[PDB]
Write a protein that binds this DNA or RNA. Structure first.
Ligand SMILES: [Mg+2]
Ligand SMILES: [Mg+2]
Length: 316
DNA sequence: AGCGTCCA
DNA sequence: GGTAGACCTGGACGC
DNA sequence: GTCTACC
């Protein structure tokens, strides 16, 4: 198919959004385990599906440059202002990251040191369905493998969008696509392991037991506590996956995922131990205390601070 | 050499 | 509620 | 990382 675009080579097809590197580093956000659907198909150029369309993104010092492949047999043209607003919303650019970094660094000198090297790590605002099923796939697993599972899940069950070069892009599957009694066995052939049943069972639960797609909007409008509790009803969603979804798709900036990385960070970089449990290893009680510890330390956007340290820890 | 354990 | 261990997969890599 | 079973 047509080639993946670069900014320098097809300038007529790109438009910019004001966005300095202090506010965003694509290379520190897009491959760091928030979204699993972005690939650096050309040096410094990241391609993926954003609001039912394929986009390529690249940065200069003060601007985020965007191009869209509409794939409705229309003539090529640069993104419109309305189309760019979707990119703006996806990166939540109304939030000023430099001021959060200053606050987090002021209360936490360890954060300040890490942040000096890892500028521009912000939080994507993801589709709730894509976020839910991607993080169901993420549990007890590594980002490289998760990325392939999500890719194959979309290849098999999501709509075909367009082909660029050798890469056929697919939308994320609908709930209905994932709910049939045949889907589990298919997801097992696609290598999802025991999470195959979690994905299909969770799609069925939402459609059959929670009122369908509107439930996720209900949770977006609910409190952190209410949304986090409700998600845990789903098979494969425990407190950590629920926190991932709250933080990254349901607009709960205080939600703090606690995985193997955050637990190692707490022990190694903060010398933290639980004080609400005599036993100190990971458990429901100690994982809960650790999330509360990070909220007490970092404040209302603690989950965003978590994203900085998580992204940094992937590179060590 | 590549099996088998560790780990995400 | 606390605790322990099993669990799909496949890359890293010690031996 | 979540589930299931047992105390
Ligand atoms: Mg560039
Ligand atoms: Mg659950």
């Amino acid at each position: 198919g047509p080639g993946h675009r670069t900014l320098a080579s097809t300038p007529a097809l790109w438009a910019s959004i004001p966005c300095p590197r202090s506010e965003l580093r694509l290379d520190l956000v897009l491959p760091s385990g928030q979204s699993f659907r972005w690939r650096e198909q050309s040096p410094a150029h990241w391609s993926g599906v954003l609001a039912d369309q394929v986009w390529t993104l690249t940065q200069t010092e003060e601007q985020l440059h965007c191009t869209v492949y509409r794939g409705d047999k229309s003539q090529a043209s640069r993104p419109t202002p309305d189309e760019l607003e979707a990119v703006r919303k996806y990166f939540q650019l109304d939030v000023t990251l430099a001021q959060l970094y200053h606050h987090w660094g002021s209360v936490d000198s360890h954060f300040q040191e890490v942040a000096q090297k890892f500028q521009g790590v912000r939080l994507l605002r993801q589709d709730p369905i894509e976020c839910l099923f991607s993080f169901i796939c993420s549990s007890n697993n590594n980002i490289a493998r998760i990325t392939g599972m999500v890719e194959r899940l979309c290849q098999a069950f999501g709509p075909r969008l367009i082909q660029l070069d050798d890469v056929t892009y697919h939308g994320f599957p609908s709930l209905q696509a994932l709910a049939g009694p045949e889907v589990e066995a298919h997801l097992r052939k696609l290598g999802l392991g025991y999470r195959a049943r979690y994905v299909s069972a969770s799609a069925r639960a939402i459609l059959e037991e929670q009122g369908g797609l509107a439930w996720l909007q209900q949770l977006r409008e609910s409190s952190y506590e209410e949304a986090h509790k409700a998600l845990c009803i789903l098979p494969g969603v425990g407190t950590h996956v629920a926190d991932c979804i709250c933080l990254m798709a349901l607009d709960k900036p205080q939600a703090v995922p606690v995985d193997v990385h955050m637990w190692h960070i707490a022990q190694r970089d903060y010398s933290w131990h639980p004080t609400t449990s005599q036993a100190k290893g990971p458990s429901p009680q100690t994982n809960k205390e650790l999330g509360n510890f990070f909220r007490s330390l970092w404040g209302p956007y603690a989950g965003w601070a978590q994203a900085v340290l998580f992204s940094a820890d992937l590179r060590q």
